[PDB]
């Protein structure tokens, strides 16, 4: 609306910009492509399959990770990308005890 602005900035953009994650119970997580690049398994998916992957089509399927775990994974991505490349203060990161075993396996799998 007001003052200097750009369409492309403000993190508005087509489907190539954002990557889609599917849970075990089918919940959808939309994250920024840069966030998705932090995990190696996801990074490896998006490099492939990928002889046809220059079609603006991105998806990851989890057959192990449900949404309560996966949300904590997404939160981690937002935090990791935001604080890196600055000297600003970085606080701790919440882990619920119940979730902890599952968050630890999902983290171990994800290569993040």
């Amino acid at each position: 609306m007001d003052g200097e602005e750009k369409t492309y900035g403000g993190c508005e953009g087509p489907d190539a910009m954002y990557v889609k994650l599917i849970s075990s119970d089918g919940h959808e997580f939309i994250v920024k492509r840069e966030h998705a690049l932090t995990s190696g398994t996801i990074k490896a998916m998006l490099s492939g399959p990928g002889q046809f992957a220059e079609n603006e089509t991105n998806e990851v399927n989890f057959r192990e990770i449900p949404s309560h775990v996966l949300s904590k994974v997404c939160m981690y991505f937002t935090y990791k990308v935001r604080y890196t490349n600055s000297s600003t203060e970085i606080p701790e990161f919440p882990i619920a005890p119940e979730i902890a075993l599952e968050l630890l396996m999902a983290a171990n799998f994800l290569d993040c």
Binding site: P97, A100, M105, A107, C112
Partner: protein, 160 residues
């Protein structure tokens, strides 16, 4: 000396040349400094609070590593696993900056869980089975030494 490399790979060398060092604890943890003697055996030293720094009279070629005092989790010195003093110059004392490493999410979670639950009850938790073994594998300096030794050999290569 004798031909060949005597002693263990990771060990300090008794180089008579002194180096003045100041340890600066840049992290939130209580840091336990460890000096590897000539034998390669880790030796503990007094712990440092997160705000503090301390003067040390080391020698060039001595080996030091740093860990969380309570947890024994790994810490970085000058962004690396091991700190080895070198000759000081006009430079004045050599600084060893202890900083928190950016732990993987999985490892951090392991750390938090470990603090929370007794080891007797790792198995009781309802988490993936594979994690149980991981939890039991707490941080260990000796293990680290073994890993470093292997990495070091890899480091060694022929010259140009």
């Amino acid at each position: 000396m004798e031909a060949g490399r005597p002693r263990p790979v990771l060990r300090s060398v008794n180089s008579r040349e002194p180096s003045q060092v100041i340890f600066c604890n840049r992290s939130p943890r209580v840091v336990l400094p460890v000096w590897l003697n000539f034998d390669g055996e880790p030796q503990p030293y007094p712990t440092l609070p997160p705000g503090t720094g301390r003067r040390i009279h080391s020698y060039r070629g001595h080996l030091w590593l740093f860990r969380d005092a309570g947890t024994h989790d790994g810490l970085l010195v000058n962004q690396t696993e091991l700190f080895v003093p070198s000759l000081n110059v006009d430079g004045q004392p050599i600084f060893a900056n202890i900083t928190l490493p950016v732990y993987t999410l999985k490892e951090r979670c392991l750390q938090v869980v470990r603090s929370l639950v007794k080891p007797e009850n790792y198995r009781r938790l309802d988490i993936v089975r594979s994690l149980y073994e991981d939890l039991e594998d707490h941080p260990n300096v000796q293990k680290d030494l073994e890993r470093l030794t292997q990495e070091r050999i890899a480091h060694q290569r022929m010259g140009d």
